């Protein structure tokens, strides 16, 4: 198990709060108990509207520290995502509430809601993923189409570029791993040749 009483009671209370929330009844957020102990949770957030993430659903790994509520939960995206403040590789998240701006009054609900707000307002000048952040600044429309394609492929969002989809299917039919292809093509500005050259170096 068991965690300290203050940690247990805070988590039971925030978990109930997420269950009863309007946001969860509108299907915007949810939390799932992974562990009878309350130390491990799985979250889910919906992509905000009018973003490349709209229509997608993003799963999160939430680990609760022994020191809760005085330290933040450890949170990572399980669902792959293309965003300047999230690692395209690990799901690691660059957000101040998860680092130095945590406050003991914050809750599972406000962390999920804050991550959805982050999807709707990236900060590319303090990035987690430099390659994504560069594309966001240097070619906004390419970034938009890449994020949307990742939302479609990994998060179940409806649409993405026909152009992009065809490049992926070309390289996958050429015998490469589908995820390696999405990553190569996304990182190399959708250039089949340097994407392919990167893929041939594995
Ligand atoms: Ca214990």
Q: DSSP labels for 39-95?
A: SEEEEEEEPPTTSTTTT-EEEEEEE--TTTTSSPPEEEESS---BTTB-TTT-BB--
The alpha carbon of 35 and the centre of ligand 1 are apart by a number of angstroms equal to 14
The alpha carbon of 66 and the centre of ligand 1 are apart by a number of angstroms equal to 8
Cα distance between residue 122 and residue 195, in whole Å: 26
Cα distance between residue 54 and residue 52, in whole Å: 6
Q: What is the DSSP code (8-state) at residue 36?
A: T
Two structure tokens written together for 30: 């949810």
- Catalytic-labelled residue, pool 7, 11, 45, 94: 94
Structural contact between residues 156 and 57, judged by C-beta atoms closer than 8 angstroms:
yes
The alpha carbon of 45 and the centre of ligand 1 are apart by a number of angstroms equal to 30
Cα distance between residue 114 and residue 133, in whole Å: 20
Contacting residues for 100 by C-beta, under 8 A, at least 6 apart:
none
The alpha carbon of 97 and the centre of ligand 1 are apart by a number of angstroms equal to 25
Cα distance between residue 136 and residue 124, in whole Å: 7
Structural contact between residues 47 and 115, judged by C-beta atoms closer than 8 angstroms:
no
Task: Identify how the structure was determined.
Answer: X-ray
Q: What is the DSSP code (8-state) at residue 97?
A: G
Cα distance between residue 149 and residue 125, in whole Å: 23
94 is catalytic: yes
Contacting residues for 41 by C-beta, under 8 A, at least 6 apart:
15, 31, 32, 33, 34, 35, 62, 63, 64, 73, 108
CATH label, 1-159, candidates 1.10.8.60, 3.40.50.261, 3.30.470.10, 3.10.110.10: 3.10.110.10
How many C-beta atoms surround the C-beta of residue 183 within 10 A? 20
**Strand pairing partners for 22?**
none
The alpha carbon of 118 and the centre of ligand 1 are apart by a number of angstroms equal to 33
Q: Which segments of the chain belong to CATH 3.10.110.10?
A: 1-159
Q: What is the DSSP code (8-state) at residue 30?
A: E
Q: What is the DSSP code (8-state) at residue 104?
A: T
The alpha carbon of 176 and the centre of ligand 1 are apart by a number of angstroms equal to 47
Cα distance between residue 8 and residue 14, in whole Å: 10
CA distances from 29 to 7, 42, 82, 124 (A): 22, 11, 20, 25
What are the φ/ψ torsions at residue 105 (nearest 5 degrees)? -70, -15
Two structure tokens written together for 119: 């999807």
The alpha carbon of 5 and the centre of ligand 1 are apart by a number of angstroms equal to 9
Structural contact between residues 165 and 178, judged by C-beta atoms closer than 8 angstroms:
no
CATH label, 160-202, candidates 3.30.200.20, 3.40.50.2300, 1.10.10.10, 1.10.8.10: 1.10.8.10
The alpha carbon of 84 and the centre of ligand 1 are apart by a number of angstroms equal to 37
Q: Which segments of the chain belong to CATH 1.10.8.10?
A: 160-202
**Strand pairing partners for 41?**
33, 62
Structural contact between residues 199 and 176, judged by C-beta atoms closer than 8 angstroms:
yes
């Amino acid at each position: 198990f068991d965690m300290a009483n203050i940690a247990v009671q805070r988590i039971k209370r925030e978990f109930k709060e997420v269950l009863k929330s309007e946001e969860t009844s509108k299907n915007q957020i949810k939390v799932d108990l992974v562990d009878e102990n309350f130390t491990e949770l799985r979250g889910e957030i919906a992509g905000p509207p009018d973003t490349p993430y709209e229509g997608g659903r993003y799963q999160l790994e939430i680990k609760i520290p022994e020191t809760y509520p005085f330290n933040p939960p450890k949170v990572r995206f399980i669902t792959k995502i293309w965003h300047p403040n999230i690692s395209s590789v690990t799901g690691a998240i660059c957000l101040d509430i998860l680092k130095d701006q945590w406050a003991a009054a914050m809750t599972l609900r406000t962390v999920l809601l804050s991550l959805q707000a982050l999807l709707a307002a990236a900060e590319p000048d303090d990035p987690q993923d430099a390659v994504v952040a560069n594309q966001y600044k240097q070619n906004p429309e390419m970034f938009k189409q890449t994020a949307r394609l990742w939302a479609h492929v990994y998060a179940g969002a409806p649409v993405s570029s026909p152009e992009y989809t065809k490049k992926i299917e070309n390289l996958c039919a050429a015998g490469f791993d589908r995820n390696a292809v999405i990553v190569a093509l996304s990182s190399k500005s959708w250039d089949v040749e340097t994407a392919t050259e990167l893929l041939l170096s594995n």
